[PDB]
Design a protein around this nucleic acid. Structure first.
Ligand SMILES: [Mg+2]
Ligand SMILES: [Mg+2]
Ligand SMILES: [Mg+2]
Ligand SMILES: [Mg+2]
Ligand SMILES: [Mg+2]
Lengths: 142, 37, 171, 205
RNA sequence: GCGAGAGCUAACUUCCGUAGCCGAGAGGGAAACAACCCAGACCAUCAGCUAAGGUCCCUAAAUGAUCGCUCAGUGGUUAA
RNA sequence: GAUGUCGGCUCGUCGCAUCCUGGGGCUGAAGAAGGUCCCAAGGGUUGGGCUGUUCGCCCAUUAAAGCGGCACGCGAGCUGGGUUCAGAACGUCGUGAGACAGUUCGGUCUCUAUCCGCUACGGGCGCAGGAGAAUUGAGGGGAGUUGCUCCUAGUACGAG
RNA sequence: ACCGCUGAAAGCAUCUAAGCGGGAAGCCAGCCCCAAGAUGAGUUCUCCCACUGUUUAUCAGGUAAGACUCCCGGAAGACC
């Protein structure tokens, strides 16, 4: 008896990372990506919005950027295949720092994995208008 | 470098200045150097 | 406690915003400081005012005070460190703005000054490091004293013009 | 940086002063410039050079156009050389000089499937004190119940050779341009009548 | 758990006393997890209130309200 | 209704409480040679004689000849010298049959890999037309050792 | 690790609480090799060109550029 599905609605959203503390920005994205206000509201399928992120490079981090915040990618058979970057050390690929916080707060299933396809991260400001040919409604964090 | 896990005063010259997460010493006599790591 | 700041002659202090820019005759200095700590002119001279009187602010009080007191001194009086070479055949020349020292090392040592500091040699056993920024002057004369520190047996190496060196003696 | 394509000709004995030098005769033939790659068009800076002449009949339409766009006349081999520009069409003259240390790279003569002894050095086993595992056979592939796995990367029997090998800092002994030849001290990888790539020393000593 | 002996005031040790649960106990909680916390399943419902636990996102529900403390990632390995 | 057990070999990988190299602080550190502590696991860590030996002692070297984990790592990988079957002997014990804290000589180690894992090699489909070529490098792996001699300079240092 | 620069709290002093520089065979890059199944499947150059087929045959069939099959071989290779 409860309400069924409609999909012919893909909503694009622009979110700015500038000065926002990672986890707190992550929460917002991860929530709009799954379903917060939720269109049909059902969990059986992907109802969430598409989230474009700008200024990925300027995301904020508290007591540790150079310290403690350590990404820990541990490669093929561990013939000491234990690679690790610091968070300051993500002056290499900053578009990943947002990505790994967001996927981290998303379901881990078949559908869950299909969700990262909706997160588009970019390190710049006025220039990231790449994946910005469709709609691009701007949503500020809090 | 004389690593004594207990840095206490020995004479009226010793100075206990807190640095990079440890109990250090900057005394007058070079032998009197005490650190906890 | 630290409060009075003497601002003589041609001083152009502009503590507007977070850019507490202090201009003068010797050269124009730029130095950033805390926003939660107040600073401007409340009379003839200068004063730094702290709001909170707990512990965290008292440390930053004496910090900001002495730092502008050093930038002001720099724009009028300036700064000059006087270093003395000690030891057999230890001598320093000059190759432009570069300090060419000969201090018992197989190949001579060359030090290039940064944009704002100047090297001087009166007698070739005396080095003068003169500049605008006390930090940079300290940080530079620091590197020269490091080329050869006074050893604990014969005091040989770079020492300050009036520096005292205790001596051990082995044999 | 600087570079050329050639064909390994062979090895001989030469003398310079009184010292006998083992030389590798290489034909670093003319290499027409076939495509220039710029940051503006290709996203990076490089040059596409070509090596052995191909009969026009043997060349297909897609390759005909690509060669025609530069007015070259079909090669057969096409290689890129990064951060290399010099105008015209690449030959060894002034590209290389007698004495220059170079990095000659080829494709090692392939030796098919090879046991852990030949391929990895191994040690095999006793020829006599009671075997079954006489000479080649690796030992123990792992441990016991802990890593129920065998380590990834484990040195085992496989296809040996037929690989890219860059031999560093080879000395340039002689150069006969017009004869389009270049003598190199030592041994270059790959078999005679094979493709070699002579480049300016990757990181010279 | 509590009260003792044996033991090194060891053991997921042993042996008595005592209370509970598991054994023969599903359900929620404790990431997972006989035993601990809550609670004892007659069957059906696409109704409602609670318990222990919880209320950033994975993950249900306050990114609650007030006065404080701690900047060590302590919280998220013990002692002289 | 079976989880093969010492030592060798083969093959590795890991910890660091570091044997050598690397960086430091203190020294009762003049110099050269060191002592001790701190940081440091990248690579390296020799060949023999004796014993089944692990160990240990010895020879000859070395920059050094590290310590420990991985079912005292590894027998569907090899050995079978040690130990634990049946034979036989010695010493001891038992009246005996026998026994061992022992010692000694002898003594069958099972052609075919299903899944996972590992090395190599293809076939398929994908990558929004069908094709022939040239590529950027997200990522991954390999490599990583060290002596002696000379120069600086018979200089700094040392009375020598 | 350790050595310093400017420097308060703590009228002095202090490499540290703000900030700064130096500093290992270690870390990240550089060297050599693999690498877009990097399903996030990328880039560039060149080619072929927009056929035909009944409400019975629902997308198959001639084709282009190109390739494959087969033959003769190979410093390629178990087969491929
Ligand atoms: Mg052999
Ligand atoms: Mg206690
Ligand atoms: Mg056993
Ligand atoms: Mg086994
Ligand atoms: Mg540095």
């Amino acid at each position: 008896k409860t309400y069924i599905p409609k999909n012919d609605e893909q909503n694009w959203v622009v979110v700015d990372a500038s000065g926002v503390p990672l986890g707190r920005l992550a929460t917002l994205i991860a929530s709009r990506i799954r379903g917060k206000h939720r269109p049909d509201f059902t969990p059986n399928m992907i109802q969430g919005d598409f989230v474009v992120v700008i200024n990925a490079a300027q995301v904020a981090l508290t007591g540790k950027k150079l310290d403690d915040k350590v990404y820990t990618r541990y490669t093929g058979y561990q013939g000491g295949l234990k690679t690790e970057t610091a968070r300051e050390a993500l002056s290499k690929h900053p578009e990943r720092v947002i990505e790994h916080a967001v996927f981290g707060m998303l379901p881990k299933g078949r559908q869950g994995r299909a969700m990262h396809t909706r997160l588009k991260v970019y390190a710049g400001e006025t220039h990231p208008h790449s994946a910005q040919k469709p709609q691009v409604l701007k949503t500020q964090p809090l | 470098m004389k690593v004594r896990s207990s840095v206490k005063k020995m004479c009226d010259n010793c100075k206990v200045v807190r640095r990079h997460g440890r109990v250090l010493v900057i005394c007058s006599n070079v032998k009197h150097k005490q650190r906890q790591g | 406690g630290k409060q009075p700041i003497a601002v003589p002659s041609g001083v152009t202090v502009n503590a507007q915003d977070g850019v507490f820019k202090v201009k003068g005759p010797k050269g124009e200095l730029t130095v950033p400081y805390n926003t939660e700590l107040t600073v401007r002119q409340d009379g003839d001279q200068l004063l730094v005012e702290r709001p909170s009187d707990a512990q965290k602010h008292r440390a930053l009080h004496g910090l900001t005070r002495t730092l502008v007191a050093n930038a002001v001194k720099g724009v009028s009086d300036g700064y000059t460190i006087n270093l003395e070479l000690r030891g057999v055949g230890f001598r320093a020349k000059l190759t432009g703005k570069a300090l060419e020292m000969n201090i018992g090392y197989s190949h001579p040592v060359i030090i290039e000054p940064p944009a704002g500091v100047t090297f001087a040699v009166p007698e070739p056993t005396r080095i003068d490091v003169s500049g605008i920024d006390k930090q940079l002057v300290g940080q530079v004369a620091a590197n020269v004293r490091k080329v050869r520190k006074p050893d604990a047996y014969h005091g040989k190496g770079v020492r300050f013009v009036g520096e005292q060196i205790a001596l051990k003696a082995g044999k | 940086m600087k570079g050329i394509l050639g064909t390994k000709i062979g090895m001989t004995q030469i003398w310079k002063n009184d010292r006998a030098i083992p030389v590798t005769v290489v034909l670093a033939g003319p290499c027409p410039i076939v495509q220039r790659k710029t940051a503006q068009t290709d996203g990076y800076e490089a040059v596409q050079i070509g090596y052995a002449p191909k009969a026009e009949r043997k060349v297909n339409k897609p390759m005909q156009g690509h060669f025609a766009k530069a007015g070259v006349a079909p090669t057969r081999i096409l290689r890129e050389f990064r951060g290399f520009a010099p105008d015209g069409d690449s030959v060894n003259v002034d590209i290389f000089a007698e004495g220059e240390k170079i990095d000659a790279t080829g494709t090692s003569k392939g030796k098919g499937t090879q046991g852990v002894m030949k391929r990895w050095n191994f040690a095999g086993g006793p020829a006599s004190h009671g075997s079954k595992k006489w000479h080649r056979r690796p030992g123990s592939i792992g441990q016991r119940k802990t890593p129920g796995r065998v380590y990834k990367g484990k040195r085992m029997a496989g296809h040996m050779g037929m690989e890219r090998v860059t031999v560093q800092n080879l000395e340039v002994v002689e150069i006969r341009a017009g004869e389009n030849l270049i003598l190199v001290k030592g041994a270059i990888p790959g078999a005679n009548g094979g493709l070699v790539v002579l480049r300016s020393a990757a990181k010279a000593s």
